[PDB]
Write a protein that binds this ligand. Structure first.
Ligand SMILES: Nc1ncnc2c1ncn2[C@@H]1O[C@H](CSCC[C@H](N)C(=O)O)[C@@H](O)[C@H]1O
Ligand SMILES: Nc1ncnc2c1ncn2[C@@H]1O[C@H](CSCC[C@H](N)C(=O)O)[C@@H](O)[C@H]1O
Ligand SMILES: COC1=C(C)C(=O)C2=C(C1=O)[C@@H](COC(N)=O)[C@@]1(OC)[C@H]3N[C@H]3CN21
Ligand SMILES: COC1=C(C)C(=O)C2=C(C1=O)[C@@H](COC(N)=O)[C@@]1(OC)[C@H]3N[C@H]3CN21
Lengths: 339, 339
């Protein structure tokens, strides 16, 4: 079995080139190739002209992609066509993969990964040293970066909103506050399914406006307050239910604790906090561990297990009431009460 | 087809996460984790201690890596062990994957990929716009980068050198010249297999000295002259056989014709020229196209088909006598004569 090593090497080589395979997709969606292929096959020449790409070089890109299953290389007349895998890339506010692909295409996203070694050495986000500014700082100043992230978070949220509204009985609640609720699709799904609920959305000012736009167009503009705020400082008191989705994993233990104590002090004895986020269990999917690493690279965050998160709550005067699933992924809804 | 669309989204999301898998490996070889595991399992704690890493973060990397098949997570006592995939990553100047993994670890390598879009719009190197300098200039000034690259090329060449010396009959030549012959392993293999042959190695000056160190160390100084120079200005004339291996694919059409015409004028009507390079045929393998894309990004190069080489040789006053298999990959030996 001398050539057992030959396969070892081949496997590791294919992993390395995987980096390039991903940048090629990033470039394909940055140029907007997949939407040009919706009305039938097109030549790489037409594709280059329409995207502002160098004709021969785009042809190399597509030939390559087709070889690894993205797009179909028709094999004549310079024609390429949509296929199962490239169709996944059609831009759509509601597509996780398509919006994330576009978000990853951004240079500063890739540059963060350039400095992965810094994260591994310090436990800190590499985004800061690679790009000369925090991820939150950048999404505050740069409307394009802000849009790429919001769209990528927005699509995941959309498919999660309806499922959370169905896993938890909000009847009995007069008021729900959504802490850092992005574009408000979770709030919007819950209000719709509970006509008597009043809601409040908390977000950074520019995102708050995005949420106002989404809620308004959902005919819920009168049922939900928008508060351009900050959840290290401001949170509404006396609400019946608080929600926080894909926020806490963005932060280190101390910061998760600072946020939790802020929520605790605003809760009524009978109030409930729903922490909605990815949990690390005993059998974490590879896919789940990668996101945990993304979180370290972009914001220095981390995915947490059942007990890691329990340890943090007990630091913040809170207790786990219930823990229920939310869509055969790693996403769980953790129902929490004041201690 | 709900279930069909889910599976497509997942397949594509894997491709995206693949960039992160590659960088995780780059970090592991940069820190030196495989070397620390040759004498049995170690804890993430000790591995961190030895490498200067942040313990909890190194643990996450290792766990992620082990989930994708690189290293074993022993599952007890915070222990990780070498395995078949991670052994491949052990620093060995004769290992293509090991040296290439280390080459790719460099931030300037990763950043060239950051700007793939530029290359795809222009057909030119993205390396220059990403790094503020050209690849050849970087490897010229900066010894670390020179060494990373020369090692990655060096290991590939060792393999190939042998395959070439045994693929071609040099028994009728008195003098051989290797143009841009790197560290000199090809010349070394050919001189070894042909005791009567004498040789000349032409390379950029700093690289030439490395060739001198290799060739002398292997007892061939007496039969190979080292010529520091530039193949755009100088090709020594009158030799029996010229060799140019993995050089032409680095250069655009104009520049390849410059090189070829100068080689043409140095040849006696009896001389042969061996162009040794990756040839694109009908239906190339993904791996061959990835390297094509690397050439694009790093130096604005491209792999070519034989017919495409033929046209260039045509504009240069040369012609193809025959092409022979070699090493059993895309590499091929194309024997040329003056026309
Ligand atoms: N100090 C702060 N105050 C308020 N919101 C913040 C904040 N820091 C980060 N955020 C918000 O936290 C959100 C994390 S993304 C999660 C968005 C939404 N909850 C969803 O599940 O889709 C971002 O939209 C960001 O705008
Ligand atoms: N202008 C120039 N003059 C001479 N050599 C050059 C050059 N530009 C690049 N090179 C050399 O071209 C080589 C291509 S790498 C291939 C090295 C060797 N032929 C092998 O197959 O292993 C590099 O070593 C680089 O130093
Ligand atoms: C708010 O913190 C998060 C940040 C900063 C991300 O970049 C990010 C996520 C986060 O939660 C994931 C959402 O998706 C889940 N958590 O399922 C996501 O990774 C899958 C998907 N939006 C893409 C990007 N990426
Ligand atoms: C000379 O031009 C080349 C440059 C500049 C490279 O970075 C590079 C190669 C080249 O040919 C390949 C060589 O080896 C082949 N051609 O198989 C290589 O990738 C396969 C393997 N040395 C690693 C790096 N990488």
């Amino acid at each position: 079995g001398t050539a057992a090593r030959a396969a070892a090497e081949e496997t590791v080589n294919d992993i390395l080139q995987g980096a390039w395979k991903a940048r090629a997709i990033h470039v394909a969606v940055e140029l907007g190739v997949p939407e040009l292929l919706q009305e039938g096959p097109r030549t790489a020449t037409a594709l280059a002209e329409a995207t502002g790409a160098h004709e021969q070089t785009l042809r190399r890109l597509l030939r390559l992609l087709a070889t690894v299953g993205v797009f179909d290389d028709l094999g004549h007349d310079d024609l390429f066509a949509q296929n199962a895998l490239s169709a996944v890339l059609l831009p759509d506010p509601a597509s996780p993969v398509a919006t994330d692909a576009r978000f990853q295409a951004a240079p500063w996203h890739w540059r963060a990964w350039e400095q992965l070694t810094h994260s591994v050495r310090t436990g800190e986000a590499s985004f800061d040293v690679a790009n000369g500014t925090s991820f939150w700082q950048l999404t505050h100043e740069d409307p394009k970066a802000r849009e790429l992230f919001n769209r990528a978070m927005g699509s995941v949220s959309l498919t999660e909103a309806g499922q959370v509204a169905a896993a938890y009985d909000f009847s009995g609640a007069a008021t729900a506050v959504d802490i850092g609720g992005g574009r408000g699709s979770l709030m919007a799904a819950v209000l719709d399914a509970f006509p008597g609920l009043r809601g409040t959305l908390l977000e950074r000012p520019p995102v708050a406006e995005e949420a106002r736009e989404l809620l308004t167009g959902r005919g819920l503009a009168d049922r939900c307050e928008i508060l351009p705020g900050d959840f290290f400082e401001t949170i509404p008191d006396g609400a019946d239910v608080y929600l926080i989705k894909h926020v806490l994993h963005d932060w280190d233990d101390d910061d998760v604790v600072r946020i939790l104590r802020r929520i605790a002090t605003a809760m009524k004895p009978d109030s409930r906090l729903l922490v909605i986020d990815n949990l690390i269990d005993e059998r974490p999917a590879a896919s789940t561990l990668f996101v945990d690493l993304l979180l370290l690279v972009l914001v220095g965050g981390a995915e947490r297990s059942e007990s890691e998160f329990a340890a943090l709550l007990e630091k913040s005067g809170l207790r786990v009431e219930r823990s229920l699933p939310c869509g055969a992924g790693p996403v769980r809804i953790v129902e929490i009460r004041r201690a």
